[PDB]
């Protein structure tokens, strides 16, 4: 009310409204789902279009051969943060000849987002990210929020109506976690998960976006006729 | 450094600081530009609430940017000096690197770019000035007349006016200026310019300035008696 003019101001109940308003931008964004087994990690994203004449906004970004994320909210902010991750992943390779741990990737994003919530002039990031990756400790899935809070999960979803997919994954937890050495089945579970967040619209060929990383699989994105298999 | 974003968008999609700068231009003394077949003429109003002035030393309303291009303006006088200075420097810098004087279009594009920069730079307000830039490109006999404004937009005009009561003199020029046949001579062009100012000015004494620019760096300012002759001639024909 009087305490939402900038990010440097606390409310009387100890809230940061600008951070909460940034969180609100994610809820407006299109749904995206993340889930993993012990061998693979999968991102499934519902892409959004302006109209029938427009293209579908690309949701998934590659960070390294072994890591990448999906976005929900302000796409330019995702581009800034994904770029930062690309550099940090790259710094780890050039200097230490070491693939950046997915956990450290999360820690770095948290600290970058935080600095924007404590200084005058700047603003919080207006996007939520789902980072998947396969490193020295197996498959991983992270959930980034622009408050700074990063969380490691077996599965999750963010965006509009993400609660439907999140409930499904909470039920299916015991099933999909043990889909080891089978990419197509883990994707199917993710495609079935994102379907619980659909209303009036269904998954078409230029609407669906899938990405996968695993033990013997580099981070690769599937769009267009390549995802027709899963509809 | 002072960083404040003074020029910003409003809910309706307007940049008020840029629009308020236009109001300063509307307050300024009237300035008119009319281009003929082989010349351009810049007319300028001078308010007559100031007597006991020293016209020898008082800053003239029309300024030479180079020997072949001139600039008049309407709005804040102090603001206009800054634009004129920058333009004059760029004119010499262009001669130095390109080995050729600026085109009127180029010089206008530069001045307009400066004005635009001051609409999305932190810590600064826009220029409260609109300019009429006239002249002839090097080795070219086609007359050029351009207009700029605080927002940064610029465009070419067969004839144009800016400043206070400009909408009245623009009305006059719109019916009196023929595109198919512009003022064939210098006299015709000056007369049409003086006529247009006489719709707004008051008296044709020391209130009107006229500057004539011709090809190949041929620029001259008319004196009181020379201008007064046009005023005397127009009024006698009017009584009919």
């Amino acid at each position: 009310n009087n305490y939402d003019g900038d990010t440097v101001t606390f409310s009387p109940t100890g809230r940061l409204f600008q951070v909460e308003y940034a969180l609100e931008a994610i809820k407006q964004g299109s749904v995206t789902v993340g889930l993993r087994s012990n061998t693979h990690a999968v991102l499934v994203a519902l892409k959004r279009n302006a109209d029938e004449l427009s293209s579908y906004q690309k949701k998934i970004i590659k960070c390294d051969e072994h890591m990448g994320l999906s976005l929900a909210g302000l796409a330019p902010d995702a581009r800034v943060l994904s770029n930062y991750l690309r550099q940090q992943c790259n710094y780890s390779s050039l200097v230490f000849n070491r693939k950046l741990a997915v956990e450290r990737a999360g820690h770095l994003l948290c600290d970058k987002a935080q600095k924007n919530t404590q200084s005058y002039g700047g603003r919080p990031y207006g996007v939520g990210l789902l980072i998947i990756g396969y490193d020295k400790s197996g498959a991983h899935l992270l959930e980034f929020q622009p408050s700074g809070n990063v969380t490691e999960l077996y599965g999750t979803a963010i965006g509009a109506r993400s609660q439907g997919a999140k409930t499904y994954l909470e039920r299916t937890l015991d099933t999909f976690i043990k889909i080891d050495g089978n990419p197509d089945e883990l994707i199917k579970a993710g495609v079935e998960a994102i379907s619980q967040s659909l209303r009036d619209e269904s998954l078409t060929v230029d609407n669906l976006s899938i990405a996968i990383v695993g033990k013997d699989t580099p981070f690769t994105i599937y769009d267009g006729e390549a995802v027709a298999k899963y509809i | 450094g002072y960083d404040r974003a003074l020029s910003i968008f409003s809910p309706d999609g307007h940049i008020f600081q840029v629009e308020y700068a236009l109001e300063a231009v509307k307050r300024g003394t009237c300035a008119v530009g009319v281009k003929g077949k082989n010349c351009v003429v810049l007319g300028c109003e001078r308010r007559s609430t100031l007597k006991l002035q020293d016209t020898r030393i008082t800053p003239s309303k029309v300024s030479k940017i180079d020997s072949h291009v001139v600039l008049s303006f309407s709005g804040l006088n102090a603001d206009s000096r800054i634009l004129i200075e920058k333009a004059r420097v760029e004119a010499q810098s262009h001669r130095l690197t390109l080995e050729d004087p600026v085109t009127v279009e180029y010089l206008t594009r530069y001045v307009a770019g400066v004005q635009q920069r001051y609409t999305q730079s932190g810590g600064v307000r826009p220029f409260g000035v609109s300019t009429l830039i006239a002249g002839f490109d090097p080795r070219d006999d086609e007359p050029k007349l351009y207009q700029t404004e605080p927002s940064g937009i610029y465009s070419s005009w067969s004839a144009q006016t800016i400043g206070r009561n400009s909408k009245t003199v623009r009305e006059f020029l719109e019916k009196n200026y023929d595109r198919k046949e512009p003022p064939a001579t210098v006299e015709e062009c000056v007369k049409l310019t003086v006529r247009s100012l006489l719709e707004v000015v008051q008296t044709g004494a020391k209130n009107i300035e006229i500057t004539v620019v011709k090809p190949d760096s041929d620029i001259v300012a008319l004196s009181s008696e020379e201008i007064n002759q046009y005023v005397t001639q127009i009024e006698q024909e009017k009584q009919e």
Binding site: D6, V8, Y120, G121 | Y2, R4, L6, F16, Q17, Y20, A21, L22, E23, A24, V25, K26, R27, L50, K51, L52, Q53, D54, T55, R56, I57, T58, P59, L76, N77, A78, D79, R81, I82, Y118, G123, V124, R125, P126, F127, G128
Partner: protein, 244 residues
């Protein structure tokens, strides 16, 4: 953050005016009147001190009239402290020009640069403008004797006779009435004092409440002399014209 407390000194009103410039001019209108009159053979500067106290040291005082170089002087109207900042800058600028070209600076060039400084404070930096209006009186070999004025907007104009500060409306009308082009210095001296004597808010105009200066070619052959009048000299010139 600090945005909360920013006055925004360099913005436009909806009408297209600069708030701070307008309010600075309102300040200057309460300052002691200063008059400049240009004659064919010299220039007069006259200025009224702001309500004097009897225990003020008058002879070793400088409030209104300042020397910029040997050929140029200024009369001040507004905040003295602000004027001194600008005066030292002007004095330096004049010496830079002389160092560069080995010639005394043309009056207009000095005026323009000082006016450009004022302009800057209205367009950028977020600072308050200088609450000062100058009357420049000077001579050079191009235009001869010249009178200029500048104000907080950074706008400057040339004059034959001009007033700044308090009661300029009344003062300008009186100057416009009695001034003529073939006027001499001694006549301009008389006009300057007569104008102040009528426009003054005080009961009667006296020597102790005045600063006076002339710029004549009254030296020996083709050279200019600045005369900042002493208290006794103002007393004598006031009697000589029959004001006291």
């Amino acid at each position: 953050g600090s945005r909360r407390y920013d006055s925004r000194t360099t913005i436009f009103s909806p009408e297209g005016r600069l708030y701070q410039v307008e309010y600075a001019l309102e300040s200057i209108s309460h300052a002691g009147t200063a008059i400049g009159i240009m004659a064919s053979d010299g220039i007069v500067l006259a200025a009224e001190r702001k309500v004097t106290s009897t225990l003020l040291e008058q002879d070793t005082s400088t409030e209104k009239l300042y020397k910029l170089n040997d050929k140029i002087a200024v009369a001040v109207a507004g905040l003295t402290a602000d004027a001194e900042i600008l005066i030292n800058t002007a004095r330096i600028h004049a010496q830079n020009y002389l160092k560069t070209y080995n010639e005394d600076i043309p009056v207009e060039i000095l005026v323009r640069r000082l006016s450009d400084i004022k302009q800057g404070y209205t367009q950028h930096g977020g600072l308050r403008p200088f609450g000062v209006s100058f009357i420049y009186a000077g001579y050079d070999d191009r235009y001869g004797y010249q009178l200029y004025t500048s104000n907080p907007s950074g706008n400057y104009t040339g004059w034959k006779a001009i007033s700044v500060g308090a009661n300029t409306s009344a003062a300008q009308t009186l100057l416009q009435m009695d001034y003529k082009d073939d006027m001499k210095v001694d006549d301009a001296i008389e006009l300057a004092l007569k104008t102040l004597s009528k426009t003054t808010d005080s009961s009667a105009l006296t020597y102790d409440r005045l600063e006076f200066a002339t710029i004549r070619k009254g030296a020996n052959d083709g050279e200019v002399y600045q005369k900042i009048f002493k208290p006794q000299e103002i007393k004598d010139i006031l009697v000589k014209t029959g004001i006291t």
